[PDB]
């Protein structure tokens, strides 16, 4: 029947970007009219696909990826970009066929004096390859000095909280993000437009 996207966009609570969530939509019909005629969204950047032509199309599988970041960082939910998120938490390929959406969530994800439940990963030995996901808490050895325990400026915790406060500024206020990825394979196309 209807493809379950309201369970993805209307989730009571989302996840941290380093631990990003993927939900696969399959064998169903969807009107994206909920999505694109909306006006409640900050970010609506589509790649390889007109979002207005989505109901006239069929795909083999659809992947809804959801997470939370700041607004200064959405730019990074984009093809071919760099920085803390793109390089170490969530990567989009240059060959992205899909759409990316976000909106302010300062009313759901912030707390007076800091909401710490949202974390991003500060560093990795290498850059995350497309669609990769990393949840490791391995003490990061900055100083190239043997690391045991956890110590100082030379051994570091790789994750950082966002400390969301409602009184923060918009680029520092919370944004829920949904990456909708649309795939055509050499097999049957279940996920289609209403018409």
């Amino acid at each position, epitope marked *: 029947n209807l493809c379950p996207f309201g369970e993805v966009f209307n989730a009571t609570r989302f996840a941290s970007v380093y631990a990003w969530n993927r939900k696969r939509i399959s064998n169903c019909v969807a009107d994206y009219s909920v999505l694109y005629n909306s006006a409640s969204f900050s970010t609506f950047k589509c790649y390889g696909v007109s979002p207005t032509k989505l109901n006239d199309l069929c795909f083999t599988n659809v992947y809804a990826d959801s997470f939370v970041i700041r607004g200064d960082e959405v730019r990074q939910i984009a093809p071919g970009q760099t920085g803390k998120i793109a390089d170490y938490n969530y990567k989009l390929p240059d060959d992205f066929t899909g759409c990316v959406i976000a909106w302010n969530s300062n009313n759901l994800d912030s707390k007076v004096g*800091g909401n*710490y439940n949202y974390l991003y990963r500060l560093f990795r030995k290498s850059n995350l390859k497309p669609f990769e996901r990393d949840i490791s*808490t391995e003490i990061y050895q900055a100083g190239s000095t043997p690391c045991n325990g956890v110590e100082g*400026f*030379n051994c*570091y915790f790789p994750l*950082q909280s966002y*400390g969301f*406060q409602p009184t923060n500024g918009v680029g520092y206020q919370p944004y829920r993000v949904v990456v909708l990825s649309f795939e055509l394979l050499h097999a049957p196309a279940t996920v289609c437009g209403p018409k």
Partner: nanobody, 130 residues
């Protein structure tokens, strides 16, 4: 709405001492960290000291150890750096920064990252010569 003013710094000679000072504004945070950073000429930014807000816990960069120390007077919301046996390579523009602490699973960690702090300040200059 967090503002920070670093104060202190001048020409000091070798073996010398100076004491720096951050000014803290708007922290409304419950668990935070304040860092001292420095950027020498033509080199990258480096961290000198971190203090936790909960207990005042502190860490230091290796070379800085034994000489520089960090304290807090909660009242003026100021954080300091007692610089004490100055050397020429300690010449730099020194910096304040603020950061949220991180609470993974109720295990508290505080990280002062030159790559990653939320709030920063203009800077203070410390020169060490004869």
């Amino acid at each position: 709405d967090v503002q920070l003013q670093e104060s202190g710094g001048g020409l000091v000679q070798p073996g010398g001492s100076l004491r720096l000072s951050c000014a803290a504004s708007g922290l409304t945070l419950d668990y935070y960290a304040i860092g001292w950073f420095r950027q020498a000429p033509g080199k990258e930014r480096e961290g000198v000291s971190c203090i936790s807000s909960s207990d005042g816990s502190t860490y230091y960069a290796d070379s800085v150890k034994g000489r520089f120390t960090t304290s807090r007077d909660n009242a003026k919301n100021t954080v300091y750096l007692q610089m004490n046996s100055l050397k020429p390579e300690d010449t730099a523009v020194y910096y304040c920064a603020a950061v949220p602490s991180t609470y993974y699973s109720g295990t508290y960690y505080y990280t002062c990252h030159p790559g990653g702090m939320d709030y920063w300040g203009k800077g203070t200059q410390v020169t060490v010569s004869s």
